[PDB]
Amino acid sequence: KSLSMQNVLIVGVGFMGGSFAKSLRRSGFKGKIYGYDINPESISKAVDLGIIDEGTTSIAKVEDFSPDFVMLSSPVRTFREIAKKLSYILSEDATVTDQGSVKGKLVYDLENILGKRFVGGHPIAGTEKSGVEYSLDNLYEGKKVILTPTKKTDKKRLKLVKRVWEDVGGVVEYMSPELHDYVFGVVSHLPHAVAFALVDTLIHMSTPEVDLFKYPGGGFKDFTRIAKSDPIMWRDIFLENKENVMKAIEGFEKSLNHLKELIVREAEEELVEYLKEVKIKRMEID
Amino acid sequence: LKSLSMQNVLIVGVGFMGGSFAKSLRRSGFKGKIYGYDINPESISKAVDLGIIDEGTTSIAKVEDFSPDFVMLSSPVRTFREIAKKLSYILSEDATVTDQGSVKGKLVYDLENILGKRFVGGHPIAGTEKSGVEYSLDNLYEGKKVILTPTKKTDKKRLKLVKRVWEDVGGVVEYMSPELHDYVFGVVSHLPHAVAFALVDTLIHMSTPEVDLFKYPGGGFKDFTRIAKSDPIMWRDIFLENKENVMKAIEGFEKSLNHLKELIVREAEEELVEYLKEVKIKRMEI
Ligand SMILES: NC(=O)c1ccc[n+]([C@@H]2O[C@H](COP(=O)([O-])OP(=O)(O)OC[C@H]3O[C@@H](n4cnc5c(N)ncnc54)[C@H](O)[C@@H]3O)[C@@H](O)[C@H]2O)c1
Ligand SMILES: NC(=O)c1ccc[n+]([C@@H]2O[C@H](COP(=O)([O-])OP(=O)(O)OC[C@H]3O[C@@H](n4cnc5c(N)ncnc54)[C@H](O)[C@@H]3O)[C@@H](O)[C@H]2O)c1
Ligand SMILES: O=C(O)CCc1ccc(O)cc1
Ligand SMILES: [Cl-]
Numbered sequence: 001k002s003l004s005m006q007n008v009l010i011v012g013v014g015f016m017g018g019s020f021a022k023s024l025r026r027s028g029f030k031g032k033i034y035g036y037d038i039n040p041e042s043i044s045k046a047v048d049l050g051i052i053d054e055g056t057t058s059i060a061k062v063e064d065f066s067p068d069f070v071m072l073s074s075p076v077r078t079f080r081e082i083a084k085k086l087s088y089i090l091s092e093d094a095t096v097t098d099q100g101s102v103k104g105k106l107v108y109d110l111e112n113i114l115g116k117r118f119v120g121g122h123p124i125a126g127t128e129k130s131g132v133e134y135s136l137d138n139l140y141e142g143k144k145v146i147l148t149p150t151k152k153t154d155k156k157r158l159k160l161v162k163r164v165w166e167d168v169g170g171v172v173e174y175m176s177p178e179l180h181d182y183v184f185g186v187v188s189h190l191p192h193a194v195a196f197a198l199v200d201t202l203i204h205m206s207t208p209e210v211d212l213f214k215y216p217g218g219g220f221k222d223f224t225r226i227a228k229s230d231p232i233m234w235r236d237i238f239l240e241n242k243e244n245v246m247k248a249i250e251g252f253e254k255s256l257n258h259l260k261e262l263i264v265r266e267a268e269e270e271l272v273e274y275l276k277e278v279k280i281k282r283m284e285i286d
Numbered sequence: 287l288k289s290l291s292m293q294n295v296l297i298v299g300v301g302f303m304g305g306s307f308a309k310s311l312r313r314s315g316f317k318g319k320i321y322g323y324d325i326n327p328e329s330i331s332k333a334v335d336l337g338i339i340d341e342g343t344t345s346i347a348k349v350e351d352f353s354p355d356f357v358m359l360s361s362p363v364r365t366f367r368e369i370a371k372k373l374s375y376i377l378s379e380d381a382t383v384t385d386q387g388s389v390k391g392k393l394v395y396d397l398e399n400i401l402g403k404r405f406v407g408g409h410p411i412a413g414t415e416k417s418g419v420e421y422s423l424d425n426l427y428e429g430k431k432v433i434l435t436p437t438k439k440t441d442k443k444r445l446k447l448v449k450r451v452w453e454d455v456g457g458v459v460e461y462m463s464p465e466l467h468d469y470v471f472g473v474v475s476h477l478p479h480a481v482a483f484a485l486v487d488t489l490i491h492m493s494t495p496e497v498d499l500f501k502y503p504g505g506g507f508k509d510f511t512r513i514a515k516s517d518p519i520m521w522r523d524i525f526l527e528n529k530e531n532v533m534k535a536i537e538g539f540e541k542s543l544n545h546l547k548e549l550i551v552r553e554a555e556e557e558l559v560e561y562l563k564e565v566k567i568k569r570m571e572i
Contacts, residue, residue: 101505124502124504124505125504126505143504144502144504179496179497182497183497183499183502184502184505186488186489186492186499187489187499187502187503187505187506187507188502188505188506188507189505189506190485190488191485191505191506191507191510191511192506193543193546194481194485194510194543195506195510196546196561196562196564196565197539197542197543197545197546198477198478198481198539198542199564199565199567199570200542200545200546200561200564201473201477201535201538201539201541201542202473202474203564203567204538204541204542205473205535205538210466210470211569212470212473212474213567213569213570215411215431215470215471215474215475216474216570217411217412217430217431218388218411218471218474218475218478219474219475219476219478219479219482219513220474220475220478222509222510222512222513223478223510224570224571225509225510226565227565227566227570227571229562229565231559231562231563231565231566232559234562235555235558235559235562238550238558239550239553239555239558242550242551242553245550246547246550246551248488248492249543249547251488251491251492252484252485252488253540253543254488254491255484255485255487255488255491256480256481256484256536256540258484258487259480259483259484259487260480260533260536263525263526263529263532263533264529264533266526266529268522268526271522271525271526272518272519272522273518274483274487275483275518275521275522276518277487277490278483278486278487278490278514279514279515279516279517279518281486281489281490281500282486282511282514282515283515284500285500285503285508286503286508286515
């Protein structure tokens, strides 16, 4: 009947932060939406789009905003040092949460830094776009949002963050931080990794007279979609989820090694079978 | 008048590509007969029902009553040889045979050995992961590359014919030796298929009694693996027929993947970024 999120801080006002801010307003949130960014232009473009009401590039200026709900949306490796400043600035009743692509250890360090204020999350929604000029107001509609509560999580804040994601249309599901990094190490980080390595392959396998990038129409096209992926976002994911990424890369090698042994032996029905399972499983999801 | 040059067309393999060929031929104003040959009698009746072929047969002998002067081989690649042996005597000396097979190389020379002057090797760089005459399109080749692989033995009159025919359906024709062809598409087509298939195979064997990874397709897995729904027989044929190149391509890819793994393990922040930045190469886009 009447609610309690006064002032919302968007930390890192780019594509995800702006999609959050826009989505939230479009769901009928009527309080303040503020921005903190190291880039004055991220805040400038954002204000000019009516995406935020006001922002800054001083973290100290954030206290004048009195945020009670903070969404972290910069690259994941900026989170810890930002949480530290925030822990001196934020009211004990503020809630802090995030859209970072990695969870695991990060969620525990952030609980430790921010005490009971922290709830880890990750919307599985993305279109590989960069910058706030690209942000959408319906990005989260029908998408899984994963929250990663731990024994220490404040239940009410868990509930508050969950409601909020539902208001922008997300479908919420809980996972342990560790399980999240495994699941997404395999389902998301590993595919990006092989996409980057494929692009690298075609660079090294071109000759001066033969440009392999002239011939995308035979299966490579979907892979070029990594053209748009942000190199700093991915460097940060790869390092922060290092262990699980190595594991996922190893399982893949395992799969690729099998397939190629089938090719070497010049199998036939084994190979056909292998391809047949893969088709069947990949069709199940679409 | 002009097309006394092509009167009776045989499509061998009345599937997605064979039917897309028949459909584009008709659409471009071909008035002659289009016949079909397939070991699957359902391919034939479906093609006739859909107005894609006028008549067809599952009996190779029958093909002689059709009197074909232009044959487009559209079955899985490893059927071409045995089929060719049947055609070498069923077909007129004045007939032309060409193909849409995804591999060239040795198979081109073999087919000019069986078929003589009749044969011209070809490969339209068009299509999708779908199988079956039901998914045939009438505009599949428009503005797509088509690679013809003439040799020192190719009849020049038949080359011009096939080339013209690909142009009448919207194709953009260029030439490659049969060996360069198999190198190029080994790397830009066959390798991305192997990699997509192995990507799916990875989620199968990294799933667990604690988690079905197929439940989370939205972080990159889906987009990158459409082509893993491709047809198992077609791909088996491709991997075996072009094995020396597929193996070289896969090894080259492992060299790239290993490089990235290396940058990740030693947390080489700057190099990683620069490796990922490779995707911003102009060569690539759209
Ligand atoms: N597909 C996706 O784009 C997607 C999906 C899920 C999660 N995420 C997560 O969203 C977060 C942000 O991603 P994005 O795609 O919006 O990126 P983006 O490149 O648009 O924006 C990042 C924004 O954060 C700002 N920023 C960078 N360093 C900062 C710092 N030290 N302090 C304050 N601000 C800083 C940048 O100026 C930019 O405005 C990441 O944690 C990422 O893992 C992205
Ligand atoms: N996008 C693509 O799917 C694509 C693109 C370019 C080239 N190709 C090539 O085109 C050919 C056909 O591919 P498709 O995707 O149309 O496969 P498809 O499965 O749709 O159709 C192949 C057809 O050949 C028939 N067939 C199988 N063995 C046969 C035999 N021994 N004799 C006669 N018919 C036989 C099948 O019954 C089927 O009707 C393949 O050589 C493939 O490499 C495919
Ligand atoms: O599905 C795709 O995008 C690849 C289509 C495609 C597959 C094989 C081939 O030889 C040419 C084209
Ligand atoms: Cl192409």
